[PDB]
């Protein structure tokens, strides 16, 4: 019967509920391990590998130029280096995500672009499915 | 649950003239359950009006149908306090709390309960920190073990929360940084004073005396933070509810790595703590272990060795991965650290049955490793064990 809502809105009402129970919790958990040299960064070689790339979202086996160039490599540098730890930058992002905006607005925040036609125009090339 | 249960109590009251004893009047008085009668989270309308209605008759129990005095005063007190916390009785809760503080009719465990209101005040920030801190600490320490089931969690929590706020808080962190900068400037001032007018030297010495007091206070508070981490570990020992306790503990050892001097402060308690509960922490914590004659590294190694003998299998995935993560390329202090880590793994592999288990883990690693390496002949989906050697 229902549109994308309701029990979905129920999970929404659940969604921000965690923070009030313990704001510190998720942060402290992630950050404690974040303190030890993780690689909280994206390898440039690993970057080109993902999005199916190639010529299809789900290309066949081995294929050409063996796997789009055994897609592989490694070595960072001064450029685009995470400052000390972008996880520290991330830590602020989480609380920002965990921050006067209405709790009810959060579902709308999800909703605002949920059925938005605009977003579907830009995404991983290929594999667009409304229903 | 209880529609006429009060009306049920009414009857024993009804036979007043023929009453065998008025202890039956003392019965409904010990009404902590009677408060529970809705206090167990009447969710639909959110458990509001009933209990406030309840404890009024509780006051009646104190007075209206009984002439007596006992801990029940503080009993209805903490309950009304909880109702107050339910509805914005900001200091009114504090008021009932102080009222309870006034009398003397129960054991010091009620004062332990009162520490909860005192911490509520610490949130309210009514008075100075040190005095109320002593007020709660004396009662918490004096009559300990008189309660255990719910006592340990709050006992740790009160000693921990404000102290950790002292360890860091935005304004407090700024204050500590300013004090540290003052000490740093005093260091250069003393350096200049090393080699005219002694007035500037004496003023700098007075400022140094002032700053040394604040530094000693912050350092003793940080040692108290270590002790509170230890108490939270003891909480993990008494009960296993809080993985939040686990993350706080993780922060403790992380600062211990940051604070090379704090390990002695963390030393003795680290002996007794069964960290086997720290399963989600386990892989990270084990990776934190270092290879040196340093107390932190040695304690980490002993803890992991205990983990293996007691129950490697839970984290034997982690240990066997650490070994399996065997890169010869990575060359640094972590290189010799991992060499000694393999040494410690072999030391843990001394025990004969544990030796068999460790060999089994290593061989399973070898098997799956060849299996991954086995990408032969571009074979069909099904793979026979005979295909690999």
Residue of B nearest to A61 (CA): B378
CB–CB of A35 and B248 under 8 A? no
> Exposure string (b/e) for B217-252, b if CB count within 10 Å is 16 or more?
ebeebbbbbbbbbbbbbebbeeeeebbebbbbbbbb
The torsion angles phi and psi of B294, rounded to 5 degrees, stand at -110, 145
CB–CB of A33 and B251 under 8 A? no
CB–CB of B284 and A24 under 8 A? no
Collect all residues from B whose CB is shorter than 8 A from any CB in A: 243-244, 247-248, 250-251, 254, 281, 284, 287-288, 378
Residues of A in contact with B248 (CB under 8 A): 28
Residue among B250, B287, B378 whose CB faces A32 most closely: B250
Residue among A29, A35, A62 whose CB faces B254 most closely: A35
CB–CB of A36 and B248 under 8 A? no
Residue among A28, A36, A62 whose CB faces B247 most closely: A28
A28 CA: distance to closest CA in chain B (Å): 6
Q: Please name the residue that has the structure tokens 């000490």.
A: B183
C-alpha to C-alpha distances, B185 to A3, A75, B173, B174, B189, nearest whole angstrom: 66, 41, 18, 16, 6
Q: How big is chain A, counted in residues?
A: 131
Resolution (A): 4.3
Residues of B in contact with A62 (CB under 8 A): 378
User: Is A90 in contact with A40 (CB distance < 8 Å)?
Assistant: yes
A34 CA: distance to closest CA in chain B (Å): 10
Residue among B248, B284, B378 whose CB faces A33 most closely: B284
Dihedral in degrees, nearest 10, Cα atoms B144, B147, B152, B155 = -60
With 0-12 CB in 10 A as exposed, 13-18 as middle and 19+ as buried, what is A119?
Answer: exposed
Q: Provide DSSP, B374-387.
A: ---TT--S---TTT
User: Is B108 in contact with B90 (CB distance < 8 Å)?
Assistant: no
Q: What method was applied to determine this entry? A: cryo-EM
Tell whether the torsion through CA atoms of B351, B356, B359 and B364 is positive or negative. Answer: negative
Residue of A nearest to B281 (CA): A33
Q: Which of A5, A3, A9 is nearest to A131 (CA)?
A: A3
Residues of B in contact with A31 (CB under 8 A): 251
**And the tokens for B155?**
């006992």
CB–CB of A36 and B254 under 8 A? yes
Q: Does A28 touch chain B (CB under 8 A)?
A: yes
Residue of B nearest to A36 (CA): B288
A82 CB-near residues (< 8 Å, 6+ apart): A40, A41, A89
Which residue stretches of B325-351 are H helix? 333-348
Long-range contact set of residues B190-198: C-beta below 8 Å, sequence gap at least 24: none
Beta-strand ranges (E) seen in chain B are none
User: Is A25 in contact with B280 (CB distance < 8 Å)?
Assistant: no
Tell whether the torsion through CA atoms of B45, B49, B50 and B52 is positive or negative. Answer: positive
Residue among A24, A32, A36 whose CB faces B287 most closely: A36
Rg (CA), chain A: 20
B70 CA: distance to closest CA in chain A (Å): 35
For chain B, helix (H) and strand (E) counts, in that order, are: 18, 0
Q: Which of residues 69 through 108 in chain A touch B, CB cutoff 8 A?
A: none
User: Is B184 in contact with B166 (CB distance < 8 Å)?
Assistant: no
Angle at B140 between CA B82 and CA B94, to 5 degrees: 30
> Gaps in chain A (C–N > 2.5 Å) come after which residues?
37, 99
User: Is B141 in contact with B210 (CB distance < 8 Å)?
Assistant: no
Axis crossing angle, helix B129-142 with helix B151-167, rounded to the nearest 10: 150
């Amino acid at each position: 019967i229902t549109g994308v809502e309701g029990v979905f809105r129920r999970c929404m009402e659940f969604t921000l509920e965690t923070l009030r129970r313990e704001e510190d919790s998720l942060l402290s958990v992630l950050e404690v391990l974040r303190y030890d040299p993780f690689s909280w960064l994206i390898s440039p070689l690993r970057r080109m590998k993902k999005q199916k790339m190639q010529l299809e979202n789900f290309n066949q086996p081995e294929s050409g130029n063996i796997t789009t160039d055994a897609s592989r490599d490694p070595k960072i540098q001064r450029n685009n280096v995470s400052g000390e730890s972008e996880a520290e930058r991330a830590i602020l992002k989480v609380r920002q995500k965990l921050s006067t905006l209405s709790v009810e607005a959060s579902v709308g925040e999800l909703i605002r672009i949920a059925q938005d036609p605009s977003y579907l125009a830009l995404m991983f090339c290929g594999w667009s499915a409304f229903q | 649950l209880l529609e006429i249960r009060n009306v049920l109590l009414s009857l024993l009251q009804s036979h007043k003239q023929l009453d065998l004893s008025d202890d039956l009047a003392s019965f409904r008085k010990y009404y902590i359950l009677e408060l529970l009668k809705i206090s167990e989270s009447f969710l639909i309308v959110d458990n509001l009006q009933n209990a406030f209605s309840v404890a009024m008759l509780s006051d009646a129990l104190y007075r209206k149908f009984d002439l007596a005095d006992e801990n029940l005063k503080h009993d209805i007190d903490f309950l009304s306090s909880k109702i107050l916390w339910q509805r914005d009785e900001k200091i009114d809760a504090i008021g009932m709390l102080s009222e309870s503080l006034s009398k003397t009719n129960s054991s010091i465990f009620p004062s332990i309960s009162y520490a909860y209101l005192g911490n509520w005040l610490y949130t309210t920030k009514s008075e100075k920190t040190e005095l109320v801190s002593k007020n709660y600490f004396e009662k918490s320490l004096s009559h300990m073990s008189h309660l255990n089931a719910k006592e340990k969690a709050k006992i740790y929590c009160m000693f921990a929360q404000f102290c950790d706020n002292n360890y860091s808080s935005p304004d407090l962190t700024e204050d500590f940084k300013r004090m540290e900068k003052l000490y740093f400037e005093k260091k250069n001032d003393i350096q200049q004073l090393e080699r005219l007018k002694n007035h500037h030297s004496r003023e700098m010495s007075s400022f140094i005396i002032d700053e040394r007091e604040y530094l000693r206070m912050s350092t003793f508070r940080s040692k108290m933070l270590t002790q509170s981490i230890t108490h939270y570990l003891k909480c993990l020992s008494e009960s296993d509810e809080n993985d939040v306790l686990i993350s706080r503990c993780c922060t403790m050892w992380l600062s211990n790595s940051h604070l090379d001097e704090l390990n002695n402060s963390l030393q003795h308690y680290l002996q007794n703590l069964p960290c086997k509960k720290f399963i989600p922490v386990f892989y990270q914590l084990a990776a934190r272990l270092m290879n040196e004659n340093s107390k932190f590294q040695q304690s980490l190694t002993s803890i992991c060795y205990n983990v293996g003998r007691n129950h490697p299998y839970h984290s034997l995935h982690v240990l066997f991965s650490l070994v399996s993560n065997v890169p010869e390329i990575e060359n640094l202090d972590a290189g010799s650290r991992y060499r000694a880590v393999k040494k410690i793994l072999d030391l843990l592999k001394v025990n004969q049955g544990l030796s068999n288990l460790v060999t089994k883990l290593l061989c399973s690693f070898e098997n799956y490793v060849s299996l991954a390496e086995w990408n032969p002949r571009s074979k069909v989906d099904s793979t026979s064990f005979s295909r690999f050697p």
